Design a protein around this nucleic acid. Structure first.
Length: 89
DNA sequence: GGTGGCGTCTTCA
DNA sequence: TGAAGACGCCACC
């Protein structure tokens, strides 16, 4: 169908804020996106790469220390207001 | 061949 | 300057 109106940053923010602990491995970010935005179930390859590009670059998201193979990703708490504002559009 | 972290390159404002 | 994202690389298993 159409792409979501949301940037990848906001899509990731939705996935993480919706989670039980507030952090997810990227495989579960993908599952959130395909479950909530069925566009991604059939989207051309590459979108996963873009999600991970955003996670690494954006200081909005922080890589969490593995507790006891993918890392967990979490929100930068100082950037939640900004992400919340952008979501309200 | 898939996965995940991060990089390159272009477009645009 | 830099947001934004399409697309690439490569260590690792």
């Amino acid at each position: 169908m159409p792409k979501p109106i949301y940037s990848y940053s906001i899509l990731i923010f939705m996935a993480l804020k919706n989670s039980k602990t507030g952090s997810l491995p990227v495989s579960e970010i993908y599952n959130f996106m395909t479950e909530h935005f069925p566009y991604f179930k059939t989207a051309p390859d590459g979108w996963k790469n873009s999600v991970r590009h955003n996670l690494s670059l954006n200081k909005c998201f922080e890589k969490v220390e593995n507790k006891s193979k993918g890392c967990l990703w979490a929100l930068n708490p100082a950037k939640i207001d900004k992400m919340q504002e952008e979501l309200q559009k």
